Amino acid sequence: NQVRPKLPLLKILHAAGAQGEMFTVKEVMHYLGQYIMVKQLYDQQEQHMVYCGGDLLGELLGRQSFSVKDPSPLYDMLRKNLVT
């Protein structure tokens, strides 16, 4: 199945090279990872830590940081930002 990201999420995905308005969840996840790399948001020493507080992504997550080892803040943002 395919989902429709809301505007600020779609702006993030497009910034990471995505095209179009609909995506599989797998590709949303791909482009969110791409975004974090492109924007250099991960900690250089502890690379599971994403420091997103200064970025639109952090605004959208409602958080300054998250760990890739506990993605619950992503699932939350996704539930709020995907029109199914």
Partner: peptide, 11 residues
């Protein structure tokens, strides 16, 4: 483990 590698855990 690099960020890109960690991100591959997410499924």
């Amino acid at each position: 483990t690099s960020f890109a590698e960690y991100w591959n855990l997410l499924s």
